[PDB]
A paper describes a structure:
Extensive classification gave rise to five different classes within this single data set. The last ribosomal class depicts the disassembled 30S subunit structure. We determined this structure to a resolution of 4.40 Å, where this small ribosomal subunit contains the 16S rRNA and 19 r-proteins. We also present structures of the 50S and 30S subunits alone at resolutions of 2.95 Å and 4.40 Å, respectively.
Residue numbers in the entry:
A (entry chain k): 12 to 128
B (entry chain g): 10 to 142
Amino acid sequence: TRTVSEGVAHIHASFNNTIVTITDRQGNALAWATSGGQGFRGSRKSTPFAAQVAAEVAGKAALDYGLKNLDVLVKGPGPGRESAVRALGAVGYKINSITDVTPIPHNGCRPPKKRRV
Amino acid sequence: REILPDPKFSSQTIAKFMNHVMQDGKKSIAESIVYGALERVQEKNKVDPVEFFETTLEKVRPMVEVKARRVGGATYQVPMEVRPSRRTALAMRWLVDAAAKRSEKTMALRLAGELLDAAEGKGAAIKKREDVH
RNA sequence: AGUAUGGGAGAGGAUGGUAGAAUUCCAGGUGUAGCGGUGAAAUGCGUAGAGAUCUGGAGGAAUACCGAUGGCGAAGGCAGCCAUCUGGCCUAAUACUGACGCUGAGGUACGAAAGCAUGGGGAGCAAACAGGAUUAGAUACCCUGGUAGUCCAUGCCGUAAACGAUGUCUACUAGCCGUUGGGGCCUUUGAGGCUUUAGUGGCGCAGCUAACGCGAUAAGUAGACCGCCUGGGGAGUACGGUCGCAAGACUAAAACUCAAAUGAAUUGACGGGGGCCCGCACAAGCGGUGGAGCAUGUGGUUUAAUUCGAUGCAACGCGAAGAAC
């Protein structure tokens, strides 16, 4: 409805769950998708096979606005980090830049204790 | 282990298909059914079956198979590549059951019917073969 | 052994000022049904509006790379940047006092974390506490909430695997390969190369050791002094005495019991121990059992007996290749 066509994308990839959000350059949300609404409801949501579909269902909803300027921002390591862009490139989205924006803290608070088992 | 081609048509594919239809070593009753189905399908179109059976089987020939590998307690189903011989074996095992699934007078007539149905695409032998699966 | 001179390195210490990132909280914009977690689920949050993103504030801790086989310090200990005070060490010989040195029972100072007292603060983390799981039981390992503390300033406490499990000082005794601060020499011809010290590493000769190993930073050969040990448990415990707000700290036995308690190494075994290998062992394909009926054996009840054996794989179409006499 805006037809701005310069919306960035935020792919937050984690070991537990991944999130895709196509927003505008300013930051207002336009189309977001999660693995929860997919229907796996478990650790299978962390698989890249689910992350690619979660990114595609968001890309198809963002296509209603006519987005073709893709600026990707990835946060957090884990599986499914590469499946998002490999799924978005299959539909034919034009890519402008790919970089790592995962924030590393500079001497923050105390991390939790290491899991023994 | 290599098999000899049939003495009638000099084709090893027909011999391997007979080895897949044959049960309990009854080569005679399998050869009879195969020859009857061939002569029946030759009546719909006067075509030598050695040219048409290959087309019909490649119409249903699969590409990849899905097997499970245990790593951490999950299935993790992924497709894998195999030699074409395994795919022909799968196709033959798919055709030998689709003909029996039908209801007709003799096995030769229903086999010819299922083969003709899978030729044009109305048979279930190609339906059971799925790409995503 | 020490003094003054000109130079060099250093998380050495005390005081004061200052900043980024990150976490949490407080609003604002778009948006919003799932978010969070376990090998699996929930306790928890949210349609008031979940999660994520952007923008402005609030306060607390530390300072990602540099970072090292680093460096400084008597030990504990010391890492963001800047200003002041101050300590120690190294390097070149010039003169100087001329044995002025080492050790050191009592004594004294410093002394990890935790804790105690006094006035504040408290972001995150978290003893004790609550809820949700597994287990026959879970009181704990797991997750979700959370109080002291972790922080600042002033005192008490003097305790740790405060370990290099190796007291301080001095002189001697083959070598090979790196690092740190200096100096000198050779063509600084080039961050070059070679030697002398002061620290910090890895092998190794001889020698020592029961073995493991040490081996110019000795556990080798030698000297001076201090401390400490006389089988194990009892027991660093009772009593006593000193210190202390307390916790407790220091000094420190006896009765009794046993014929053991130890360190290293060898050969096996184990191992949920990291590999390696193989196995119709796991993968794949085909056909059965387990469902029905019958033959056969065994197990249980009964009778006069239902003759006796065989009992996980390795007993059960077994002894028996064949009970109407």
